[PDB]
Design an enzyme around this catalytic site. Structure first.
Site: not given
Lengths: 344, 10
Positions: A33, A145
Site C-alpha cells: 500500500i 509488466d
C-alpha cells in the site's frame, strides 16, 4: 523519541520518520500500500510505499529484493526517483517492514487514456516510455509488466515508470503468458497495447480473464502464424491450435482516422504514422515485432529523439545479483536487511 | 516540433 512514529491509516499502521507528515492513502502497487505524505525537511510532496514483512514468502522476497537493488542502482528522468528508504525496526532480529520514499506524480496513465490527446502528446508520452524502457534494457532488465497503473505522469507532461518489484491483465506479452520464453521486446507489446488504448480511449480488448483476452486479441489481430505455433509448448500449442481461427483486421479498420486527433502542423505526427508504428508494435509473434531502438527511430517517435536522453550509460548491477538462486526465509530476510541497511 | 509542457489532469 526515536526518529519514527506511527499513524493508523485504516487497518494499516505506517511507522515513518517524523519528517513525513500528513499521510494520505493513495493506492496499492503489486506488493504494498502506498501513502502520499508531506516531507517536512525537503518541504515537498512525497510518496511512501510499505512492504510489510516482504521476507514472508519466496515470491514476495524475490520481488522486494529486485525492487531494492534496482531502485538504488537505476536513475533516469523517466524512471520514478528514489528519495529515501528505511525500516523503523532497530535490528535484524526485530526487522520486518521496509519503507520506500519516492517522488510523487500527479497521475497514473489510467487516466490519460481517458482524455483526448493531441498527437504531440501521445507521441511524446510514448517517447518517454520508450526511453525509460531503453534505459532498463541497456542494463539487461526487462520489465515484463508494463501497464497504465504502473506508469505515472505529471501535469507538465513528464512520465516516469514505476516498478521492478516485477521487473527483471492482457498488457503482458503473449510470449510471457504462454510460458514461451522471451526477449527485450516483450516490453514493446506492452507499449503497443497502451498506445492502442490511448488512441481508442478505453480498453483495447473488452476481455475479462488472462485467456478471455486471448480470444478478443486473436479475434482482432488474427490467429498467429502456423510456424509460430511450433515455437509453443506441446502443452500449449494444443490449446492455441484448437481455438477458432481469425483473419484479423487491418490496422486501418482497427484504428481508423475517426479515433485520432487532427493531423498536426508537423509532417510525421499523423494518424498514418501512428497506425504504422502501432502495427509494428502490437504484433503477437515477437520475432516479427519491432525493438525499442526501431520504435525510437520510427518517424512518429523520433521527432523527440535525444541521444543524451536515449543513450545514457547503463545502470550497472553486480551480476552477483540476478536472482540466480532460490532461498529460505532466514537468508532472504538477511539479504533484504543488508540491502536496506546499505540504503540508509 | 516542440515538446509539450502542460498536461491536463481534469
Amino acid at each position: 523519541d526515536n526518529n519514527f512514529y506511527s499513524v493508523e491509516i485504516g487497518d494499516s499502521t505506517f511507522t515513518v520518520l517524523k519528517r513525513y507528515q500528513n499521510l494520505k492513502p493513495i493506492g496499492s502497487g503489486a506488493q504494498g500500500i502506498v501513502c502520499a505524505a508531506y516531507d517536512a525537511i525537503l518541504e515537498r510532496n512525497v510518496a511512501i510505499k510499505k512492504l510489510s514483512r516482504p521476507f514472508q514468502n519466496q515470491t514476495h522476497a524475490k520481488r522486494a529484493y529486485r525492487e531494492l537493488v534496482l531502485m538504488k542502482v537505476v536513475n533516469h528522468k523517466n524512471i520514478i526517483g528514489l528519495l529515501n528508504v528505511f525500516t523503523p525496526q532497530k535490528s535484524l532480529e526485530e526487522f520486518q517492514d521496509v519503507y520506500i520514499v519516492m517522488e510523487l506524480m500527479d497521475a497514473n496513465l489510467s487516466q490519460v487514456i481517458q482524455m483526448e490527446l493531441d498527437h504531440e502528446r501521445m507521441s511524446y508520452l510514448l517517447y518517454q516510455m520508450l526511453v525509460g524502457i531503453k534505459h532498463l534494457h541497456s542494463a539487461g532488465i526487462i520489465h515484463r509488466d508494463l501497464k497504465p497503473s504502473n506508469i505515472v505522469v505529471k501535469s507538465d507532461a513528464t512520465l516516469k515508470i514505476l516498478d521492478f518489484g516485477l521487473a527483471r491483465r492482457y498488457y503482458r506479452a503473449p510470449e510471457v503468458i504462454l510460458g514461451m520464453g522471451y526477449k527485450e521486446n516483450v516490453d514493446i507489446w506492452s507499449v503497443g497495447v497502451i498506445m492502442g488504448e490511448m488512441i481508442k480511449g478505453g480498453v483495447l480488448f473488452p476481455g475479462t480473464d488472462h485467456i478471455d483476452q486471448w480470444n478478443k486479441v486473436i479475434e482482432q489481430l488474427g490467429t498467429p502464424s502456423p510456424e509460430f505455433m511450433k515455437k509453443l509448448q506441446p502443452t500449449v500449442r494444443t490449446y492455441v491450435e484448437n481455438r477458432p481461427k481469425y483473419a484479423g483486421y487491418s490496422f486501418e479498420k482497427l484504428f481508423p482516422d475517426v479515433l485520432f486527433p487532427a493531423d498536426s502542423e508537423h509532417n510525421k505526427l499523423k494518424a498514418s504514422q501512428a497506425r504504422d508504428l502501432l502495427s509494428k508494435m502490437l504484433v503477437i509473434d515477437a520475432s516479427k515485432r519491432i525493438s525499442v531502438d526501431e520504435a525510437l527511430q520510427h518517424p512518429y517517435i523520433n521527432v523527440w529523439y535525444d541521444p543524451s536522453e536515449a543513450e545514457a550509460p547503463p545502470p550497472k548491477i553486480p551480476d552477483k545479483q540476478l536472482d540466480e538462486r532460490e532461498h529460505t526465509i532466514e537468508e532472504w530476510k538477511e539479504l533484504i536487511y543488508k540491502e536496506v541497511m546499505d540504503l540508509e | 516540433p516542440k515538446r509539450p509542457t502542460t498536461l491536463n489532469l481534469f
